[model samples]
Target: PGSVVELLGKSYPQDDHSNLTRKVLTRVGRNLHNQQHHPLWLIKERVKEHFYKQYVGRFGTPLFSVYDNLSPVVTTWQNFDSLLIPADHPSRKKGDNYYLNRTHMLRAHTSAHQWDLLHAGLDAFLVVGDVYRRDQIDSQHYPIFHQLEAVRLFSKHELFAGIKDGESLQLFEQSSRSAHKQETHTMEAVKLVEFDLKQTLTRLMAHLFGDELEIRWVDCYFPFTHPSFEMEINFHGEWLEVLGCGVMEQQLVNSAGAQDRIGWAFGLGLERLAMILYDIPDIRLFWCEDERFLKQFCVSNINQKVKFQPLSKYPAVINDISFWLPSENYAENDFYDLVRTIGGDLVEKVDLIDKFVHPKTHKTSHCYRITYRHMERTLSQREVRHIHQALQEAAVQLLGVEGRF
Candidate 1:
């Protein structure tokens, strides 16, 4: 693999001689297999195709667009500022993000493209891509995840002309009468848009979950949406949030040169829904390279959901790496990234077993127990120790920490 790759007509180097870690370099290639192998890709395509068909059937032509292959690399402006995220939003920190440099990063969500697409004069579109975030180590959390974003827009004429018969027309009229106002949108226009937005989303959910799916909407907050909401589905006796959405803020619409239009947008985690649908238990399982795991599902069978057969989990080897803080300002994410970079998938989990602050010096010491195991085969003690030694060395060099053992 080379040190640089061109994305969106610009070049990004791996920065091997610079400060960035090698983990970022190795993951640069868009692993479409990660997209193609995981059942989620199939699910996303099915949903998009169905939505496209339904929109065409209703509007008598294709009115929305689908963008699934956009690159994950984006500017800070696209990911945050354009969305109106506060300057001090915690997600902007280096610890929470994988920065290619000071100004660019792996997009944290698919919503990063919303503003650009809106500015390009697209009234309706869907974007799907891999999103990166530094997160807790667990069965449910992963640093890299996939997201699906959908947006639809309507002008007053389009909204009024789209409705056909008596019942829907009446509902539209009633909604128009009750809709609230934004700086650029009238009460009637906002209400009609909201009505169509919820209606389209309800049908889409029903399409995915079938008619008997139980769903609830909870009020929420976001930088780009007014009257935001989170959608939760009752799955296995638990309420799991599946997506976040809201009416597109008038300011964003106006910025997109669509001031006269009202719109709605939603972003959903693909793995969240895929886990429930395919009965996959662990988030890490998606990355398994074992034949037992990869051979069970076929890309050709798009219509059917194959339940993942659980393989016997290999025994775990535990090792503890304890260290003293290089500085009071050191972030835990830097340490975690170091571990992942060295250990790769052999690392099952890393748990902080101990932490103490010295009363006199105010210096902190931390101990992390890293659990290592292979999914398909048992690992050797000698191999584990060799890797652990490498991790300790890398930590001292890359993170500027003093390793204790």
Candidate 2:
């Protein structure tokens, strides 16, 4: 393996901890969100237009600045530390992310730019980019996806505008009723900002999903935000998680040299929104360059409701690899990454169909069922067999598993 890799015209050294693979590296500059006539691009523009119309910058221009071209590669501090994610957070594991080395990786979320922009004096801005994550193979999941992050900071005067007896209200307090709010923030301030946060997102949803949009907010927790929430939009008979948002953690804002500012931040999944709005069934379709899929989503059709007419479904070939554990150190994500590296996009799904220990040998065994099919065409037996064979070899060599039958 090469010790150095080129990503988007830049070179970075790889280490033993690096988990990025060739197939994943191929997606580095795909930049689907920047592609014109693509649903992701269209939705990004629409969201920016909404912000431009509703708010104005402190300098008397469009409120939110757009930073779509920022590099996806970031330091561990930028991705996790800047956001107040714990060092021991499960999301930081090598299995869950693409680490270029010990300290760098493809950003997993647009929020990684939060501190940089905030420190650069951008009180309101939007960051749109591709995020990488290792995940289960499924119709609705891909290693790369687009996200739009919206962050807006507020001053005491701006937050409590037009309120009764607002003169006595302070921005910070030493205590809160519960963890649902920040202790450094006054209850009145958190309450008002939370209300605005919901209303602003609801209005954005209404703009995209129409005035009759149905929405629900579920309380959750994140390392960076107290009382974090996920907003789900009920559509097409499912409650799709649209985005995650919450009040900005005081500690983070303070680090940005904005101790006097408090605001709400959210990260919206572009693919999820487009899937619902465009009636697209599969997440993989977004990356497909087939004219049959691309021709339908003309730029003009962005704001208008459109349904994606899928091409004919192709038959999938099934292959199973039963293995005896060479050791107990096998990680399922590493196996998935290897399959993707060898099988690429043709492999549809990989599932651990069965797992157990052999009573006589006292060794563990795992059987994984892999579904192979091309997204745009038929799969030939020879091609599928070649990939399956390579996967088995790689498993024994790299994954340290012994093949069974």
Candidate 3:
């Protein structure tokens, strides 16, 4: 038993065991902290500071809300006319998100906050908080994690020239080998989506990281964000997925209270970012509280280094080649690989200028303008022709097709 105290004319029980025993339990049970120092804790703190600093600098003070029973609730199910998430929306399915009993489920994204923000009438805002899910626990999967969410409204003139509607300027999806194996006919459909994601992410990375940054998009998925993206930044010798992002859906906007706002958001992994910033090799080091790791950080501005390499110093030659094949047979990646393999260092770019299926023959024809050049020496027409001949032969042998120049 302990003593009772009064503060501000109110009573508080200050007992170790008493009437509050059923309500309060303190951590004298297990000393989990005695086991090991988790370096990831410090890393997480640093990342939070870094991001918050950036967020405040860019936006302003963020509103912190507490969830209580009195707080507002806008249901996407019953309030479909309000939140706009359709009743049968694939996103509403139980398979995609973990539902709490039957009425409440874990929010799959932070865009739900946007509706509330708009209701309060704000132009631009950001949300940084934790979201939960029923994901399987593993090295990368966690039931709880933080997300940095943001939204901006645009007037008619402020929208990106690339975006046509209130939706994203980009549209696409990537599939795993399993999806490909299930329906090989979907490869072309899927490839188109993969290319769009790659192109958009490449543009974004180049805008922020540096024009010199090399980027590639690999196939990835998520229920809410599709075609979901896995962006790889060229680091050292390998590429890493810095984050995943995609265009927002209308339902997400409506849930937040804004029915027509268009936006894009990215969910970045803090651990992966720390690894990138510090050049740490293993993710485990982030979880280990080692002074050596802490001491490596200089506490200085660490903007990415920008370097622009000059293109070929020699004269470049471009050859246009056309190919016809079965409507479902060819892929751009395979053709690009074959061209680079055949032309070696001389191959600079392969631009597909035309592609369509012939109406009568039902054959698809693709025309690419291939550029050849190297830094040290100009390529001769004869050498370029020879490479093109090799590429054509490989295409026929590997893809069962013929080339027309």
Candidate 4:
């Protein structure tokens, strides 16, 4: 169907049967959990409420507004260009992203809304929503996930006022002694902004993971922020990255007509955080409608941590499909995407089992093993064969494979 559909105040040409597959369309309309009684929604709302209260109490005013239901569809400019991502960035590749058309796509991250919010004259805000990415199939990776973005700006006057305070003054002084800066900024100004950024994020982490948790800040890079950093927490003797953040580039500020402001911005993977907090083993469980999973969470249990119990272990059905290589340029990710599109979450893994090249024809061949298993129940043999048949047909037609089984 080529009808027009409206979502989150934006209209888009629908292609549910063509460019957009049924699986994606089905997910687009599954915002039901967003209402209430869903664990994912409850966790998201609780995070928002805690951050709001923390900021309000610290600043003595409502410093940040929350936007949890913004549209996921956005232009390339809003998703990449406005954030200063270069034209040739690998993230823009079609295979790596979900493009609706040449001009629009499902947002890869909540940071896509930063430029628009800043342009609207908002100094501080939080953007929380679902994001899409073409990714590998695993316990932690999914084509769709949720993100939380936090952006805060400080005017020149506010910057200096914070620096004059006793605690902030010490932070600024300590930061000025460190080695990080833009040549255009004075040491004092750079130190003040850096201190504010680090302090704000420290408070945020402390709120999310108690003050006793061990945390580390590692240097990183992001096109949108100069001197970017990733925050990692010690979880069961393992270091896990939970969020990325940095001082907002002055160029982005000027683009938003806030040339007189300095600030920090951060984006956190909500699923990753929630998985750890609630002891969720598989990301697929978030989409399950079984009473076993749904009955364990409620809005009232926001602050409590509950370990998820497995209902039963199901047997996995393994199968393999082999085909001649289509072209030298064929990417494995494309094949993986096909498996996910057709198999959905039931597909546990797609491992390359064998690969070889014909000596005379010089054509390469590949064999992949696909493991299908449900988290809550067992899949019937007939159902899997039907899916496998569809995969074989699609591979030959879409990927130009010579033959497959």
Best by lDDT: 2
Superior candidate under TM-score, 1 versus 4? 4
Across 89-196, the per-residue lDDT of candidate 3 in tens digits comes to: 665544334333244333454545655665676645555443433332123433334444444443222343333563443222333434332111133333343443
Question: Per-prediction TM-score, please?
Answer: 0.86, 0.94, 0.39, 0.87
lDDT of 2 by residue, 367-391 (tens): 9999997779999999999889999
Best TM-score among the predictions, by candidate number: 2
Q: Write out the backbone clash pairs for model 2.
A: none
Provide the overall lDDT of each model, using Cα atoms, as 2-decimal numbers.
0.76, 0.86, 0.48, 0.76
Tens-digit per-residue lDDT, 1-405, candidate 4: 246644555666644211444466557646533758666676677667776777667753336788888778888899999999999999887777776766678889999999999999999898888888877777788778888898888765566663445334211222221236543445656667777667767876676567777888898888887567898888878888988988777678779998777768899888788777667777888887888987877535566655566667788899899999876757677788788778877888888989999999888899999999988889999989999889989888887887856
The RMSD of every model to the true structure, in order and in angstroms, is 4.5, 2.2, 22.5, 4.1
Which prediction has more favorable TM-score, 1 or 3?
Answer: 1
Better of 2 and 3 by lDDT: 2
How well does candidate 2 match the true structure in TM-score terms? 0.94
Model 2, which residues run further than 4 Å from truth? 56-62
Any runs in candidate 1 off by more than 4 Å, and if so which? 1-20, 33-37, 60-62, 161-188, 299-301
TM-score: model 3 vs. ground truth:
0.39
Q: Count the backbone clashes (under 3 Å) in each candidate.
A: 0, 0, 7, 0
Better of 2 and 4 by TM-score: 2
